[PDB]
Design a protein around this ligand. Structure first.
Ligand SMILES: CC(=O)SCCNC(=O)CCNC(=O)[C@H](O)C(C)(C)COP(=O)(O)OP(=O)(O)OC[C@H]1O[C@@H](n2cnc3c(N)ncnc32)[C@H](O)[C@@H]1OP(=O)(O)O
Ligand SMILES: CC(=O)SCCNC(=O)CCNC(=O)[C@H](O)C(C)(C)COP(=O)(O)OP(=O)(O)OC[C@H]1O[C@@H](n2cnc3c(N)ncnc32)[C@H](O)[C@@H]1OP(=O)(O)O
Ligand SMILES: O=C([O-])CC(=O)C(=O)O
Ligand SMILES: O=C([O-])CC(=O)C(=O)O
Lengths: 157, 273, 273, 92, 89
């Protein structure tokens, strides 16, 4: 059940990791694209407590929540359907499985480079079973101008 | 008068065992000040006498001095030196400025010494191999204290972790805990190359190793001095040099009251409470 | 981004000159930490680099170390050690206890160093002979700071004033101010035999003498470091060892909250306010 | 100058929410100091505004005042007052 | 403040000044102190006790705030330092 419209102007994402540069780039792209809401709803970092990160919305200061668990991030933001997994090559697999255990996540973009091919094939099999679209376990992202931008794709503004 | 001839008893509080001011000479542990200076033990020796109440071997004294020197200062941007500079720049006395900077030394700033030693000691005493300790810390959602540098990673050493490590290798007799910490460092640098031992972690592990590896400690004293906070004491005593240096600097440069810029605050007050 | 390519200017506050941590190595004055450890300068050397920003000669470094060791502790009955013991015995952290004991170091406790140096320097620089300086203190109704001991007087010296004095004689090149202080000591001991130089007064005069008698100081830097409070800094840094030792002692003896005896208070409250 | 006309961004640390002195009047939570004094809300009220950031009801403000008065002192023999007396008696 | 606000117009009585002067005048003209008592209190240091006490509420409220906002360790921007270290000591 893979969808055809991966990104909409109402798309929101959950970034897995302290990648504040990438999230700031996404917010800058959102603002310059005349979007009404940020495309990053929450960030998940398992190594720190739940707090709020201060980011830019053009000129304004906004607060993006940072969660320690993926579960509470998923519950507090039920309309999020994209996960951008910034985990390393030795932590992307289990994180991607745990994400795919949530039905609301329709696409996962894995940025890590160097995942072993057996684990990648397991990821492919379970994503096909769950109908999730994994955009590339070695990528930089996919950019849909005016709509969405995955991580660092395109560069700075 | 009634106590001089001893017809009365009063209970004495304040048991003390680190100094005897009374009598002919100052006595630190049991060894008079003249013997302290005649045996040529330095500041490390008097930390051995006052803190641990023991006449430590020469390499232990020199290592204590070394770890005081590496700790002395790490620039003015760090939180404690910031407080010392702010208070010195407000016209306060040396004691108030050093005190206001010292009051920051806690768990988040300056707490890596004792935390890294406690963590590595609890790992090593429970018989976990390094590869399982790294995975346990990852599983628990906790970072390893004493491991991790911002920039200086590989063929780019801390250059003062190197000095301390060389001293520990050439002079300490046995380093069961430093070797364990270095294996954990090898694993974490396999992960990411800037996850090397801190100076804050190497001093902790090498001090625990010195306590339980040299003589005069029974591993029930060595494991108690870590719990009490002797490593917090070493960080505070070492960084007092840098904080007083910052006070003297800001007071010699003749700089006036600091008021924070309003554009670096971002007031977020409620609407109308 | 706008500053990396440098199209904008922001004024930088917090001028600092005692440490630089941005770069390959820690730099204390201009001296990398590797050079600090390679030339084998001790804690006295890093006080020279951090406090006075100068690479002091070997005897100056060793004398700074010596005066830190003599200052380290003087028993628990003293006011500052009393506060450290009280706060350590109330379950507080090392930093809070040391801080609460350090906050006492002021004019009445711990102030004899800087006051004795200021007084002797002002007397010596104005060309008063010792016999007239003693009488001019007497006419002003003021005692000479740095002179006067409770018990140890004659053929009974302080036994650590002796060690410091011997070091100053055999290693310092010239002691114009220590000689003046010793003449004043001779006069006041003619008065009463227990009016000898304190350690608190000998350290002060010998430190002023070291500052203006060795190289690298221009008598406008040496007279400024005394005014700023470098001797208060030496007392605080030396006595931090003793205060942390008292904290560790009271925390190892496992002693509980202190409550002052009500019989040693005397309440003189008003009748009915 | 470049921020007055706003061609640059700098991230601001020190988020604060208990006082604002930039402006015409002091503002504790959201209510100016003149409104603080005109509403006759006392020290308990300004603890409500500064600590909890809320305009507490009158009885809670008076209770905060009450528990400050009962806590004010408990003699000199207790440990903290002992340290204050020792340090005050040392000329500090 | 009439003589000084003629000079520059912002040279008015600050809250400091006002509290200071009005406390010296409540201590001296209220009926309980005897103008020597009321001048010991000013010197011992009883007006630095008012300021201290006041600030204490605000200070705690800025602890209680930065703890509710869960803010982390502050490493000072290095572009705002200007190290002036000597050449080689
Ligand atoms: C032109 C182009 O660029 S196109 C190229 C396209 N490919 C890419 O974009 C790939 C680039 N990205 C990557 O490969 C990277 O792996 C990233 C950015 C996704 C993440 O990399 P890292 O920074 O290594 O990941 P992370 O920050 O999580 O840290 C790695 C490990 O350090 C560990 N660690 C960090 N600090 C500590 C500490 N103090 N103690 C112990 N462990 C620690 C973390 O636990 C983490 O462990 P894990 O790997 O077991 O989860
Ligand atoms: C059986 C029998 O006993 S019967 C014998 C009968 N005879 C007697 O009773 C005589 C006994 N009494 C005496 O002789 C003594 O002189 C006393 C008790 C009267 C007083 O003696 P002292 O303690 O020397 O006097 P005092 O305490 O004033 O100190 C002496 C000097 O030290 C000086 N001094 C003290 N501390 C300091 C200091 N820190 N710095 C500089 N000077 C100091 C004082 O200025 C004083 O100076 P001055 O003599 O120029 O005024
Ligand atoms: O020692 C600490 O914990 C903090 C410190 O000096 C640093 O900024 O590296
Ligand atoms: O140094 C001081 O001023 C106080 C002191 O140690 C003493 O009791 O002799």
């Amino acid at each position: 059940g893979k969808s055809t419209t991966l990104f909409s102007r109402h798309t929101k994402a959950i970034v897995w990791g302290m990648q504040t540069r990438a999230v700031q780039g996404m917010l800058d792209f959102d603002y310059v694209c005349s979007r009404d809401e940020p495309s990053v709803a929450a960030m998940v970092y398992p190594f720190t407590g739940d707090h709020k990160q201060k980011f830019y919305w053009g000129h304004k200061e906004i607060l993006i929540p940072v969660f320690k668990n993926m579960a509470d991030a998923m519950r507090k933001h039920p309309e999020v359907d994209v996960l951008i997994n910034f985990a390393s090559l030795r932590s992307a697999y289990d994180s991607t499985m745990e994400t795919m255990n949530y039905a609301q996540i329709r696409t996962i973009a894995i940025i890590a480079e160097g995942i072993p091919e057996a684990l990648t094939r397991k990821l492919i099999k379970k994503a096909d079973q769950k109908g999730v679209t994994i955009i590339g376990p070695a990528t930089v992202g996919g950019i849909k101008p005016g709509c969405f931008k995955i991580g660092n794709t395109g560069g700075m503004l | 008068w009634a106590r001089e001839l001893g017809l009365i008893r009063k209970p004495a509080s304040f048991m003390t065992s680190i100094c005897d001011e009374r009598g002919q000479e100052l006595i630190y542990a049991g060894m008079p000040i003249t013997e302290v200076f005649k045996e040529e033990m330095g500041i490390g020796g008097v930390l051995g006498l006052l803190w641990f109440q023991k006449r430590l071997p020469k390499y232990s004294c020199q290592f204590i001095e070394m770890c005081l020197m590496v700790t002395a200062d790490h620039g003015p941007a760090v939180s404690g030196a910031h407080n010392t500079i702010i208070c010195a720049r407000a016209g306060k006395d040396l004691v108030s400025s050093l005190t206001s900077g010292l009051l920051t030394i806690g768990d988040r700033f300056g707490g890596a010494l004792d935390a890294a030693a406690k963590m590595f000691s609890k790992a090593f005493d429970s018989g976990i191999i390094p590869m399982e300790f790294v995975n346990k810390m990852k599983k628990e959602g906790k970072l390893i204290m004493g491991i991790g540098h911002r920039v200086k990673s590989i063929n780019n050493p801390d250059m003062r972790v190197q000095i301390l490590k060389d001293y520990v290798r050439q002079h300490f007799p046995a380093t069961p805990l430093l070797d364990y910490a270095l294996e954990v460092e090898k694993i974490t640098t396999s992960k990411k190359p800037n996850l090397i031992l801190n100076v804050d972690g190497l001093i902790g592990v090498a001090f625990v190793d010195m306590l339980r590896n040299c003589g005069s400690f029974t591993r029930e004293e060595a494991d108690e001095y870590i719990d009490i906070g002797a490593l917090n004491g070493i960080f505070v005593l070492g960084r007092s040099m840098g904080f007083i240096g910052h006070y003297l600097d800001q007071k010699r440069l003749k700089q006036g009251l600091y008021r924070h810029p309003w554009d670096d605050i971002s007031y977020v007050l409620p609407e109308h409470m």
